[PDB]
Amino acid sequence: AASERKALQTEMARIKKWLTFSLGKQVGNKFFLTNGEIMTFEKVKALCVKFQASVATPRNAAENGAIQNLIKEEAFLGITDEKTEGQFVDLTGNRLTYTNWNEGEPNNAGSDEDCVLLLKNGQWNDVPCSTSHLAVCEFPI
Amino acid sequence: AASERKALQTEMARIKKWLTFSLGKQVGNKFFLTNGEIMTFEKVKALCVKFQASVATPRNAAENGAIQNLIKEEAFLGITDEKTEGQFVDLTGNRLTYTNWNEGEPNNAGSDEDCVLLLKNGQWNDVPCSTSHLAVCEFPI
Amino acid sequence: AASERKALQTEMARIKKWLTFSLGKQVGNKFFLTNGEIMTFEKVKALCVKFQASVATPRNAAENGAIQNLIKEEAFLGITDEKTEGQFVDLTGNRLTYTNWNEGEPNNAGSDEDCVLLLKNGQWNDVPCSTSHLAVCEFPI
Ligand SMILES: [Ca+2]
Numbered sequence: 236a237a238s239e240r241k242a243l244q245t246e247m248a249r250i251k252k253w254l255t256f257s258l259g260k261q262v263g264n265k266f267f268l269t270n271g272e273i274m275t276f277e278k279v280k281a282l283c284v285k286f287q288a289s290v291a292t293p294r295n296a297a298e299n300g301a302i303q304n305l306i307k308e309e310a311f312l313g314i315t316d317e318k319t320e321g322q323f324v325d326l327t328g329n330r331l332t333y334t335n336w337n338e339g340e341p342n343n344a345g346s347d348e349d350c351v352l353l354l355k356n357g358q359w360n361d362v363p364c365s366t367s368h369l370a371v372c373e374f375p376i
Numbered sequence: 377a378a379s380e381r382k383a384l385q386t387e388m389a390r391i392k393k394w395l396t397f398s399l400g401k402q403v404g405n406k407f408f409l410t411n412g413e414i415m416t417f418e419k420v421k422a423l424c425v426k427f428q429a430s431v432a433t434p435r436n437a438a439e440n441g442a443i444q445n446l447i448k449e450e451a452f453l454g455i456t457d458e459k460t461e462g463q464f465v466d467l468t469g470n471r472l473t474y475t476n477w478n479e480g481e482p483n484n485a486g487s488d489e490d491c492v493l494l495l496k497n498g499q500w501n502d503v504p505c506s507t508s509h510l511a512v513c514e515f516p517i
Numbered sequence: 518a519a520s521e522r523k524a525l526q527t528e529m530a531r532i533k534k535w536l537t538f539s540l541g542k543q544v545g546n547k548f549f550l551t552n553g554e555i556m557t558f559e560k561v562k563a564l565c566v567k568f569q570a571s572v573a574t575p576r577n578a579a580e581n582g583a584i585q586n587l588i589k590e591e592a593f594l595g596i597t598d599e600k601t602e603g604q605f606v607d608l609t610g611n612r613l614t615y616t617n618w619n620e621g622e623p624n625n626a627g628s629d630e631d632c633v634l635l636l637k638n639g640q641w642n643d644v645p646c647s648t649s650h651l652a653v654c655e656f657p658i
Pocket residue numbers: 316317320346347348349
């Protein structure tokens with residue numbers, strides 16, 4: 236009967252189990268993944284979008300730690316103050332409820348730091364959007 | 377007809393081929409995987425269990441080498457002598473038929489070394505279960 | 518109705534999306550993957566073949582860069598001049614249209630360099646086939 240379909244769904248459920256265990260980090264309904272490539276902010280934006288994903292945007296400590304665990308280099312976050320200087324916000328325009336700025340940040344040094352960078356210790360630093368950093372996308376899971 | 381089902385099974389077989397090639401190490405009916413996180417023994421136990429897997433327990437040189445190849449840091453094994461000091465055993469209570477102790481091991485230093493650690497060279501060292509080391513689970517494949 | 522089949526195909530399409538994003542590098546109809554193990558050329562050949570894949574053979578800059586991005590160590594390419602010294606060719610006998618030799622290469626040093634090695638900077642160097650290097654296979658995607 237639908238024995239095949241039964242086996243397909245069972246096979247899929249385990250493949251998905253493996254992936255969430257070792258391919259990336261799952262926190263709720265988000266799945267953080269990196270292609271291991273560094274590029275400018277606009278590029279990462281296009282990239283994630285190209286995959287039906289969005290740039291990783293930690294909305295709480297758990298997510299921040301998850302991204303922290305995943306990365307081997309500083310990664311751009313889906314946060315900027317491009318439109319209103321000093322007012323950091325989501326790629327959807329939503330203001331942040333959780334922040335983890337590094338000491339002395341944000342400082343908008345050189346009057347040109349509108350992007351945010353997740354550092355290896357989990358802290359953040361505002362950096363120029365034109366710099367090249369690790370691409371990380373959150374996929375809906 | 378069942379052309380779709382045909383394609384689904386073919387698609388699944390190749391996805392599985394990719395995963396066994398680059399996601400982890402397959403040795404017989406075991407699939408070794410790591411989430412790249414270090415934690416205490418009890419945590420790793422819970423973790424693997426949480427994924428229908430068990431802590432990696434090499435039962436022969438091939439498996440030991442496979443785990444060795446997979447890891448980038450010392451990993452806990454599913455072996456302990458908690459119940460009977462000096463008598464190392466499986467998470468199922470089965471005694472070991474294969475061991476790869478490091479020189480001078482096991483020594484049960486500090487009278488508190490009931491867990492086993494796979495070192496980068498494949499050799500083993502008994503360590504305190506309360507230490508934090510890389511999590512590795514063997515999944516049924 | 519075929520709601521399941523619908524869901525299976527949707528589930529598969531996203532699993533495939535994740536894999537092409539983080540498991541390997543896709544360039545056209547090729548999917549480059551590495552098992553992270555170093556071995557002699559003949560071994561890598563057998564390995565890829567064993568997986569219905571072939572040794573990675575960059576046929577253009579995009580592919581070369583893709584392989585370059587993927588690797589953490591020097592990787593053998595599916596190119597040799599075993600049959601006709603100096604005449605480098607595909608594993609299918611096809612002559613190369615794209616090459617990226619390193620300065621001073623190829624030199625066939627020691628009169629025993631019939632294999633090709635992709636270096637970390639993307640350049641190539643002819644090396645003895647008996648040396649052990651990273652295995653990389655291109656899978657049909
Ligand atoms: Ca600004």
